[model samples]
Target: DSAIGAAEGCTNQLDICFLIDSSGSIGIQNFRLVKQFLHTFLMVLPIGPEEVNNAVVTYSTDVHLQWDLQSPNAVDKQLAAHAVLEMPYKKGSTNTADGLKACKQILFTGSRPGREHVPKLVIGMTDGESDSDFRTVRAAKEIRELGGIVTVLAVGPLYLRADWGQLATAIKPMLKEVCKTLPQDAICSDWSAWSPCGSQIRTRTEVSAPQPGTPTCPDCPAPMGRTCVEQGGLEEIREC
Candidate 1:
């Protein structure tokens, strides 16, 4: 797993799935936001090849897919995410290491648009600590050695209610160990909802809050330069 073209896969595409799901917001500037987010970091939520894998596999498993498992742009893939999200939580033992290992394996074996040089990123999300014993250290180590970025998001206090419930404090070390130089900062908390997926794209050290009346740059975001008016019979024109 310690190889670029070596560590298996990042499944960096999940963000794309989210975008398509909310096709309500699937245009340029919106995509710009997601792309910006990825340039910063990567999340969880897995969909499998057969039988939705299993509860144990789903909650705490790393399952790699066949190269060409589905066309990267296949609508079904988007639908697959939709389906999995809707699936009843089949809670099972957490095998985060296995799930991560599988990602590494699939990434290495699969040939895609950016298999060699593009940054490799894998995001894993879990509600509880890993249930089965796994080579968490070695697996994460391989990821970093292979030039990959690992972001482990634990659904911690934000979601957990009982004190008997564990703390992300437990998994933090191993995730830090497995992460690249990004390390601790790369591990994110606050998974109460999907909104964090966009908000936590960058670690705290990477950003700062704007002070009162801070003159934020104007036109920082791309603006709509044209209005689609009802005039033409067929062709559309770009005013900007």
Candidate 2:
């Protein structure tokens, strides 16, 4: 299947914001994988000179702009590549509330009326749980009110073993109940998670990694290469 966007109309530009978790827990290999996936995703978009725009934000204890929404052409590609390459892995407690606040500022501040109709999307990738519930929930509510679609991708065991799991689980249901949320999609197996959603876009070409060996970033350890064993069980909850 192709991973490119459809050639529908040129007037409507989708605003995609990638909210990445750069906390200490996310390994460098995983971080590289995320970047690789993002690079592939952008390359496959059917966006033309004026079709769609993209932006990125990375958060740990603080929020920072990887790149702001711009044309998916050569210039923007260079800027984004530089940003991604230079983004050092940060280690700190997760402050997701702050991340959401930063996203809100990026999306809602500045030009208000002109870009209001554009479809806004927030794709949050996190390996651990959030630090604060009240702030995260309130910010998510505000984002939904602005006609934004929020998709949360909880990467790895943090959602189940960490205190942030409560916030992690609440994110999906809360956003879904608001009618503006997409379904939960996870990349639990291999990196093949892109396969299921391949039909959503047009371009489907794959790029080889910059090097063959494992990523050597200071944060990524050697043990991460081992296969992850899935723990069996399910959590039961009552709907009230």
Candidate 3:
């Protein structure tokens, strides 16, 4: 898909569905952590009607569509945070396949008007392997066949074995791969030694290769400040 809104670093306007497992294996405390983790994940995205459209689907023995892309919560972070945090856990058997199917249905049919062409991204988070492994794999395959990217996060000691902290850390970079969000700011080196007092003394910094394309950040971070101190105050001498 051609990139859109490159100025914000987010290339594609996506339809992202989060498939969360609320089974017995993940206790209520951990479930709370999962919700927290999800809320943090939601804030990382550029959520808006013109950006990402989000859906939250939870499943254990049955699937519950907490919210869909068409809902008002999907287009705003604060609204989505409230909805996600308020979700009730449905503890039972791990019905991951059913959850994936529910997400597929939502992504394909429940999108907002004029957003049908957006790329679909699904992140399935579960603490244990699905009760029906064969069906789980098949369901994932079907989503991929429909041109959706399915990323399953297997957690807990019995599965891929990850704490919520690790999962949260890992998923950020993973999303960059799946959805192509350019860095918000270009990587730059430490300020060069303060230049021997010019008009007001100064320092310089250089941006590494492949500077970000987003308008939010400059090709090289601006060199500013004075007082023979390279790290104090902000004074625009020349915007880099």
Candidate 4:
């Protein structure tokens, strides 16, 4: 049970939604970084029909609902990842209000079924100020009123027009937010590279505190097995 617990990302029920900023200020490069952050965040979460439910919305001049918990591929991590990757870069005015509204109506408040007991979490990413301050605050307030947790990832430097602190329950820098999933035992350069000396590639990681047993990082880039050729093709047999 402890081993499984160590590997699990999130153990409780959570209905999370990501509001990605694709406004004109955030260029294609920045937008790509946001997508990558989303992918990394998703990879660390326990996602499934029975686990953490996820939804994504891209906002600029308009809000694009990429996917929701009920979406066909939402239950599968690989399919959900593809869905996120396929989200296009929408460049226009940052209509953050519309994104929050979509999350409230489409995913959080009046959307989904039998998830009233689950906690609602909305993660909004932005590079600069929103076009409409009043509307954005109103929408954010509505989500807070509905007991939804809003976290903001402030990307890049920008002028603060709106009450960002009031807009979000918690605010974190973009990279810091993504790195929250990094293993506690791993450090910037304290970890040894995966050794190729044996079948089981091993890596040594630095820990903050000393422990009785030697600490090791998980086997990364683990090897996988191959499948038979398709269309009745012969399989290549090799010696170990």
Candidate 5:
């Protein structure tokens, strides 16, 4: 009795990949937000042989393949992904470029049917700059050149204050240079604060003083969770 459903033509076999930034900068609890964001996002897709196939790539100093592109014909994508979301956080430096290349690898690993013929969408979410900015730009370019639709989401606080210089060099500005299009889509969000909840984690992007009143994370942060919701909207996310 809250959010509305997505309308018109929801069935199409699309291959989706999630590139997550799990650096120390994102904070341990904040990393939960990244997982929650993806869990919710997947619920909306038309899954199975007739729908979408998906995977996740998390990078810090190294790339960890959380899940590979599952069967497009597989009955439950989320069921297989439960193990992926449960994967522990890999805390270290930021290497967003490595994450992108890993995404391509997952897509081409010879599991799903008709790899190149399928629609490939790479959604990249990062909190800071990569170790090699030049490499980051190149990898993103290669993703597009290889026929993948790229969407980069650079999120951090509205007013970084003392960290503005770091933000300029590492976050939105740098990520923008690597993206394919749209300044607004690749825009940053607040560096969400974290909280502990048993084996799980949660986030709260409270408004910072310099910005005065606006919350840190986006209002419409893809809202699905443990139980895939399809009439569409955010839901209760939990540990598998």
Candidate 6:
């Protein structure tokens, strides 16, 4: 009885949804990287027989549910493996909005008939900018309301605007605001890699290459790496 209680207290199942980008930008190699990343992530987690339920949603112009929420044990491993192996090579305009809409549908459908509390998560990966802002925003808002964490990881520099560093600058705050009303947290990343363990998905960013040539120094007596200048100031150094 004590062992049973301890097991119940420590072990809990978590639901994860992987929203992968399968558009033209994501080649087969990158697709395999995604699958391998997910598999490694799951292997690292302290998942028991019935703990940790996961699903995959591949998105391009449309969305495909590679696998529904299922256990990650030997019995269900084949199902998940097959889902990853049979993922279709999709090529079309990236409709992130459609992907979110499909994710909402999957979550709204709920798990089987009986299950523990649903700790929901949606990890969205994209290599290109979303085609529709309105739909994407709306779906993100809805997901937040349902007590789910929505993590948006930009796979490359595809969504970065000249004025802003990345598209996350615009979408992240909105997602946070909407998620504030829910029970889970929301975050955004402008990186190419992600790994999910338990209820949290970790994101990794690639290092940007440094620009060529040494920059002029204005503050120091000699030339330094770079000079910090006030915004909207003249190129020449002058007192404020």
Question: Best candidate, lDDT-wise?
Answer: 3
Per-residue lDDT over 1-240 for candidate 6, one digit per residue giving the tens place of the 0 to 100 score: 212111222123345577878888767766666665556444433334444466778878787767665433322544565556556777876777777777766665645344324445576776646633523577766765554556655555112221113433434343333223222111112433334443434333323221111111222121111111211111222222
Q: Candidate 2 on 1-240: residue-level lDDT in tens?
A: 222222121122345676888887886767776676556455544333333456678888788777655333322545555555556677787777777777766666622333534445666776646533322566766766665545566655112221232333443333233222221111122222222332432122222211111222233321111111211111212222
- What is the lDDT, from 0 to 100, of the residue 180 in candidate 5? 20
Indicate whether candidate 1 or candidate 3 has the larger TM-score: 3
lDDT string for model 1 (1-240, tens) is 221111221121211111111122233333333333322221122333310111111332224232232343222434443333432222233445556566555444432432232233454443235312222546656754554444443332111121212332334343233222221112122222222331332211212121111111232211111111211112322321
**Model 3 misplaced regions, further than 4 Å:** 1-10, 131-135, 157-161, 180-240
Clashes per candidate, residues 3 or more apart or on different chains: 8, 7, 0, 0, 11, 0
What would you estimate as the lDDT of candidate 4?
0.54
Output the lDDT of residue 105, model 5. 72
TM-scores, all candidates, are 0.35, 0.54, 0.66, 0.59, 0.55, 0.53
Give each model's whole-structure lDDT: 0.30, 0.48, 0.64, 0.54, 0.50, 0.48
Q: Which tens-of-lDDT digit does each residue in 58-103 have in candidate 3?
A: 8889988888888898888789977888999777887777777788
**Superposed model 5: Cα runs more than 4 Å off:** 1-11, 70-75, 109-111, 130-136, 157-240
Off by over 4 Å in 1: 1-57, 61-70, 73-88, 131-135, 157-240
- Candidate 2 regions exceeding 4 Å error are 1-4, 7-12, 47-49, 70-83, 110-114, 131-136, 157-240
lDDT of 4 at 119: 48
Off-target runs (Cα >4 Å) in candidate 6 are 1-11, 46-49, 70-82, 131-135, 157-240
Better of 5 and 6 by lDDT: 5
Error of 4 at 120 (Å): 0.5
lDDT of 4 by residue, 1-240 (tens): 211112232123456778878888878876665666567566656666665678888889998988777776556677777778778887788888878888877555544575553445667777756534423567766665454556665545211222332332222233233223222211212334444432434334333221111111133221111111211122222232
Error of 4 at 103 (Å): 0.6
